[PDB]
Design a protein around this ligand. Structure first.
Ligand SMILES: CC(=O)OCc1ccccc1
Ligand SMILES: [Cl-]
Length: 162
């Protein structure tokens, strides 16, 4: 297991524009296109991202390319964030994957309310952090995925993805 395999499991792979769990236009391995209700707006974002006129459909190679860019962007966003970087650098590699997973799903703003969870993770109070992480809109709206990520933080193993 690695972050790419983990997120590929959590996000799936679809080569035509679809709606994510929140109803937003998405493609590939969970690449958000837009929060606008306009399919044309989503198609424009797609063409801009791929560099050609796609009319809502991409290849597997293109999906994987976008996915690599998106994972890298999540990592670099963590490393540029004064709140997240110290916590990230305190973690082992398996738990760093759980961290990237959350940023990929919710972005830096989506994790802003997790200050207490972040402190517990930095303190390595894993069971306490797991309890706190579940007290969230995130867990309630995507509980199976959140449970996998939380188990990864709790145990430091890949057991939830095996
Ligand atoms: C904020 C959160 O709970 O997950 C994202 C994260 C976690 C630890 C370090 C960096 C980002
Ligand atoms: Cl879920």
């Amino acid at each position: 297991m690695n972050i790419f395999e983990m997120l590929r499991i959590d996000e799936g792979l679809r080569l035509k524009i679809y709606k994510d769990t929140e109803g937003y236009y998405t493609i590939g391995i969970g690449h958000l296109l837009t929060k606008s209700p306009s399919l044309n707006a989503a198609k424009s974002e797609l063409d801009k991202a791929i560099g050609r006129n796609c009319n809502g459909v991409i290849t597997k190679d293109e999906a994987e390319k976008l996915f690599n860019q998106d994972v890298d962007a999540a990592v670099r966003g963590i490393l540029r964030n004064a709140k997240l970087k110290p916590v990230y650098d305190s973690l082992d590699a398996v738990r760093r994957c759980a961290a990237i997973n959350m940023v990929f799903q919710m972005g830096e703003t989506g994790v802003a309310g997790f200050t207490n969870s972040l402190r517990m993770l930095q303190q390595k109070r894993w069971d306490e952090a797991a309890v706190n992480l579940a007290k969230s809109r995130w867990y309630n709206q995507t509980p199976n995925r959140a449970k996998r990520v939380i188990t990864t933080f709790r145990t430091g193993t890949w057991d939830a993805y095996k």
